[PDB]
Amino acid sequence: SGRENLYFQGMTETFAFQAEINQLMSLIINTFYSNKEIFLRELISNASDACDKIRYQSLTDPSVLGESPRLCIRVVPDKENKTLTVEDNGIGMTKADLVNNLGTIARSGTKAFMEALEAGGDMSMIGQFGVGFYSAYLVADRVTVTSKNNSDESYVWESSAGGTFTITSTPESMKRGTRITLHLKEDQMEYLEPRRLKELIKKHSEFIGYDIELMVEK
Ligand SMILES: Nc1ncnc2c1ncn2[C@@H]1O[C@H](COP(=O)(O)OP(=O)(O)O)[C@@H](O)[C@H]1O
Ligand SMILES: [Mg+2]
Protein backbone atom coordinates (compact mmCIF):
# COMPACT_ATOMS: atom_id res chain seq x y z
CA SER A 1 0.00 0.00 0.00
CA GLY A 2 3.04 2.25 -0.60
CA ARG A 3 6.06 2.05 -2.98
CA GLU A 4 5.15 -1.54 -4.14
CA ASN A 5 1.49 -0.73 -5.05
CA LEU A 6 0.82 -0.96 -8.83
CA TYR A 7 -0.66 2.59 -8.81
CA PHE A 8 2.12 4.25 -6.74
CA GLN A 9 3.53 7.42 -8.35
CA GLY A 10 5.79 9.06 -5.79
CA MET A 11 6.29 10.26 -2.27
CA THR A 12 7.22 13.59 -0.65
CA GLU A 13 8.48 13.76 2.97
CA THR A 14 8.73 17.07 4.91
CA PHE A 15 11.47 17.83 7.48
CA ALA A 16 12.10 20.79 9.77
CA PHE A 17 15.53 22.45 9.67
CA GLN A 18 17.95 22.33 12.62
CA ALA A 19 17.15 25.53 14.66
CA GLU A 20 20.26 27.62 13.80
CA ILE A 21 20.15 26.60 10.12
CA ASN A 22 16.53 27.86 10.00
CA GLN A 23 17.67 31.13 11.68
CA LEU A 24 20.55 31.46 9.14
CA MET A 25 18.22 30.88 6.16
CA SER A 26 15.76 33.57 7.37
CA LEU A 27 18.71 35.96 7.90
CA ILE A 28 20.15 35.25 4.36
CA ILE A 29 16.83 35.38 2.42
CA ASN A 30 15.79 38.78 3.92
CA THR A 31 19.18 40.59 4.19
CA PHE A 32 20.31 43.43 2.00
CA TYR A 33 23.87 42.62 0.72
CA SER A 34 25.70 44.46 -2.10
CA ASN A 35 27.93 41.55 -3.33
CA LYS A 36 25.32 38.70 -3.82
CA GLU A 37 27.31 37.18 -6.79
CA ILE A 38 29.44 35.10 -4.29
CA PHE A 39 26.56 32.51 -4.34
CA LEU A 40 27.92 31.22 -7.69
CA ARG A 41 31.40 30.55 -6.29
CA GLU A 42 29.80 28.42 -3.50
CA LEU A 43 27.79 26.30 -6.03
CA ILE A 44 30.89 25.72 -8.21
CA SER A 45 33.08 24.87 -5.16
CA ASN A 46 30.51 22.25 -4.03
CA ALA A 47 30.41 20.74 -7.59
CA SER A 48 34.26 20.58 -7.61
CA ASP A 49 34.39 18.94 -4.15
CA ALA A 50 31.83 16.29 -5.31
CA CYS A 51 33.95 15.60 -8.47
CA ASP A 52 37.06 15.23 -6.28
CA LYS A 53 35.29 12.60 -4.12
CA ILE A 54 34.33 10.34 -7.04
CA ARG A 55 37.65 11.01 -8.87
CA TYR A 56 39.71 9.71 -5.90
CA GLN A 57 37.30 6.77 -5.43
CA SER A 58 37.75 5.95 -9.18
CA LEU A 59 41.54 5.55 -8.76
CA THR A 60 41.01 2.38 -6.63
CA ASP A 61 37.75 1.29 -8.35
CA PRO A 62 37.26 2.67 -11.93
CA SER A 63 33.79 1.00 -12.09
CA VAL A 64 32.39 3.81 -9.80
CA LEU A 65 32.37 6.14 -12.84
CA GLY A 66 29.99 3.79 -14.72
CA GLU A 67 29.02 5.38 -18.07
CA SER A 68 30.03 8.95 -17.07
CA PRO A 69 33.85 8.95 -16.50
CA ARG A 70 34.41 12.55 -17.78
CA LEU A 71 34.05 14.70 -14.66
CA CYS A 72 32.73 18.17 -15.43
CA ILE A 73 30.52 21.05 -14.36
CA ARG A 74 27.71 22.79 -16.26
CA VAL A 75 26.08 26.21 -15.61
CA VAL A 76 22.56 26.43 -17.06
CA PRO A 77 20.59 29.74 -17.23
CA ASP A 78 16.86 29.46 -18.11
CA LYS A 79 15.18 32.86 -18.84
CA GLU A 80 11.71 31.34 -19.45
CA ASN A 81 11.60 29.53 -16.07
CA LYS A 82 13.72 32.25 -14.31
CA THR A 83 16.18 29.61 -12.98
CA LEU A 84 19.95 29.22 -12.81
CA THR A 85 21.23 25.63 -12.54
CA VAL A 86 24.69 24.19 -11.62
CA GLU A 87 25.17 20.52 -12.57
CA ASP A 88 27.95 18.06 -11.83
CA ASN A 89 28.56 14.30 -12.28
CA GLY A 90 30.39 14.10 -8.96
CA ILE A 91 29.80 11.61 -6.11
CA GLY A 92 26.15 12.61 -5.60
CA MET A 93 24.18 12.55 -2.32
CA THR A 94 22.18 9.58 -0.91
CA LYS A 95 18.77 10.27 0.73
CA ALA A 96 20.62 10.31 4.08
CA ASP A 97 23.23 12.76 2.72
CA LEU A 98 20.46 15.16 1.56
CA VAL A 99 18.57 15.05 4.91
CA ASN A 100 21.77 15.18 7.06
CA ASN A 101 24.02 17.56 5.12
CA LEU A 102 21.40 19.98 3.84
CA GLY A 103 19.51 21.00 6.91
CA THR A 104 19.31 18.67 9.93
CA ILE A 105 22.90 18.23 11.18
CA ALA A 106 24.10 21.20 13.24
CA ARG A 107 27.07 23.12 11.79
CA SER A 108 29.41 24.43 14.54
CA GLY A 109 29.98 27.71 12.67
CA THR A 110 26.29 28.64 12.12
CA LYS A 111 25.97 30.73 15.32
CA ALA A 112 29.46 32.30 14.94
CA PHE A 113 28.61 33.28 11.32
CA MET A 114 25.36 35.08 12.25
CA GLU A 115 27.27 36.77 15.14
CA ALA A 116 30.03 37.82 12.69
CA LEU A 117 27.40 39.37 10.33
CA GLU A 118 25.92 41.56 13.14
CA ALA A 119 29.49 42.60 14.22
CA GLY A 120 30.41 43.79 10.69
CA GLY A 121 31.80 40.53 9.28
CA ASP A 122 31.80 39.71 5.57
CA MET A 123 28.90 37.64 4.07
CA SER A 124 31.53 36.44 1.52
CA MET A 125 33.15 34.43 4.42
CA ILE A 126 29.98 32.16 4.53
CA GLY A 127 31.93 29.18 3.04
CA GLN A 128 34.69 29.44 5.65
CA PHE A 129 32.05 29.11 8.40
CA GLY A 130 30.94 25.73 6.90
CA VAL A 131 27.50 27.00 5.63
CA GLY A 132 28.36 27.97 2.04
CA PHE A 133 25.38 26.18 0.48
CA TYR A 134 22.88 28.60 2.11
CA SER A 135 24.32 31.60 0.12
CA ALA A 136 21.92 30.45 -2.68
CA TYR A 137 19.12 32.30 -0.73
CA LEU A 138 20.90 35.66 -1.36
CA VAL A 139 19.63 35.43 -4.99
CA ALA A 140 16.91 32.73 -4.90
CA ASP A 141 13.50 32.36 -3.19
CA ARG A 142 13.51 28.57 -3.87
CA VAL A 143 16.29 25.98 -4.30
CA THR A 144 15.78 22.50 -5.78
CA VAL A 145 18.60 19.92 -5.45
CA THR A 146 18.31 16.69 -7.55
CA SER A 147 20.96 14.12 -6.67
CA LYS A 148 22.00 10.55 -7.40
CA ASN A 149 24.69 8.62 -5.50
CA ASN A 150 25.81 5.11 -6.72
CA SER A 151 24.60 3.47 -3.47
CA ASP A 152 21.00 4.93 -3.57
CA GLU A 153 18.00 6.09 -5.71
CA SER A 154 17.67 9.64 -7.07
CA TYR A 155 15.93 12.20 -4.71
CA VAL A 156 14.86 15.81 -4.93
CA TRP A 157 15.50 18.14 -1.91
CA GLU A 158 13.59 21.46 -2.02
CA SER A 159 13.10 24.49 0.18
CA SER A 160 11.73 28.04 0.07
CA ALA A 161 13.38 28.80 3.50
CA GLY A 162 10.06 28.66 5.40
CA GLY A 163 11.41 26.48 8.22
CA THR A 164 11.09 23.17 6.29
CA PHE A 165 12.42 21.24 3.31
CA THR A 166 11.02 18.32 1.31
CA ILE A 167 12.55 15.10 0.01
CA THR A 168 10.73 13.68 -3.08
CA SER A 169 11.22 10.23 -4.62
CA THR A 170 9.64 8.55 -7.67
CA PRO A 171 9.78 4.88 -8.90
CA GLU A 172 11.62 5.97 -12.10
CA SER A 173 14.38 8.65 -12.08
CA MET A 174 18.84 11.56 -13.15
CA LYS A 175 22.30 9.93 -13.71
CA ARG A 176 25.11 10.08 -10.98
CA GLY A 177 25.73 13.60 -9.63
CA THR A 178 23.81 16.67 -8.50
CA ARG A 179 21.75 19.39 -10.16
CA ILE A 180 21.16 22.53 -8.06
CA THR A 181 18.44 24.82 -9.48
CA LEU A 182 17.89 28.30 -8.08
CA HIS A 183 14.54 30.06 -8.74
CA LEU A 184 15.71 33.68 -8.88
CA LYS A 185 14.16 36.56 -6.90
CA GLU A 186 12.49 39.32 -9.11
CA ASP A 187 15.46 41.78 -8.77
CA GLN A 188 18.11 39.07 -9.43
CA MET A 189 17.43 38.43 -13.18
CA GLU A 190 21.05 39.50 -14.10
CA TYR A 191 22.29 35.99 -13.21
CA LEU A 192 20.40 34.75 -16.34
CA GLU A 193 22.61 36.99 -18.57
CA PRO A 194 25.31 35.09 -20.53
CA ARG A 195 27.90 37.91 -20.22
CA ARG A 196 27.30 38.31 -16.44
CA LEU A 197 27.69 34.49 -15.98
CA LYS A 198 30.77 34.12 -18.26
CA GLU A 199 32.70 36.82 -16.33
CA LEU A 200 31.51 35.51 -12.91
CA ILE A 201 32.63 31.94 -13.84
CA LYS A 202 36.06 33.28 -15.00
CA LYS A 203 36.29 35.40 -11.74
CA HIS A 204 36.34 32.39 -9.30
CA SER A 205 37.37 29.32 -11.42
CA GLU A 206 41.11 29.62 -12.29
CA PHE A 207 41.68 27.18 -9.36
CA ILE A 208 38.79 24.74 -10.29
CA GLY A 209 40.37 21.58 -11.81
CA TYR A 210 37.28 20.60 -13.86
CA ASP A 211 35.87 21.97 -17.08
CA ILE A 212 33.01 24.46 -16.44
CA GLU A 213 30.68 24.74 -19.44
CA LEU A 214 28.26 27.65 -19.66
CA MET A 215 25.21 26.48 -21.65
CA VAL A 216 23.92 29.08 -24.15
CA GLU A 217 20.12 29.64 -24.51
CA LYS A 218 18.06 30.33 -27.74
N1 LIG B 1 27.02 19.38 -5.72
C1 LIG B 1 27.11 18.65 -4.58
N2 LIG B 1 27.44 17.33 -4.65
C2 LIG B 1 27.55 16.60 -3.49
N3 LIG B 1 27.38 17.04 -2.20
C3 LIG B 1 27.02 18.38 -2.16
C4 LIG B 1 26.87 19.23 -3.26
N4 LIG B 1 26.50 20.50 -2.88
C5 LIG B 1 26.44 20.48 -1.52
N5 LIG B 1 26.76 19.18 -1.05
C6 LIG B 1 26.76 18.73 0.33
O1 LIG B 1 26.21 19.78 1.21
C7 LIG B 1 27.22 20.00 2.21
C8 LIG B 1 27.17 21.48 2.65
O2 LIG B 1 27.73 22.28 1.60
P1 LIG B 1 28.39 23.65 2.14
O3 LIG B 1 27.34 24.36 2.92
O4 LIG B 1 28.94 24.34 0.92
O5 LIG B 1 29.54 23.19 3.10
P2 LIG B 1 30.97 22.58 2.79
O6 LIG B 1 31.25 22.59 1.29
O7 LIG B 1 31.97 23.51 3.56
O8 LIG B 1 30.97 21.16 3.34
C9 LIG B 1 28.55 19.57 1.62
O9 LIG B 1 29.47 19.19 2.66
C10 LIG B 1 28.12 18.28 0.83
O10 LIG B 1 27.94 17.13 1.71
MG1 LIG C 1 30.81 24.19 0.03
Residue numbers in the entry: -9 to 163, 165 to 209
According to the publication:
Among the chaperones, heat shock protein 90 (Hsp90) – alternately referred to as Hsp83 or Hsp86 because of the variable molecular weight amongst different orthologues – is a hallmark of the stress response at the cellular level, and a major component of the eukaryotic proteome. Its main function is to serve as a molecular chaperone helping nascent polypeptides avoid mis-folding and limiting protein aggregation during thermal stress. Although the compounds represent diverse chemical scaffolds with unique properties, they all inhibit the enzymatic ATPase function of the chaperone by binding the ATP pocket in the N-terminal domain (NTD), which together with the middle and C-terminal domains define the highly conserved Hsp90 protein architecture. T. brucei Hsp83 (TbHsp83), the subject of interest herein, is 59% identical in sequence to human Hsp90α.
In Trypanosoma and Leishmania parasites, Hsp83 is implicated in thermally induced stage differentiation. The structural differences observed between each complex and this previously determined parasitic Hsp90 were linked to the nature of the inhibitor bound to the nucleotide binding site and not to any Trypanosomes' specific structural features.
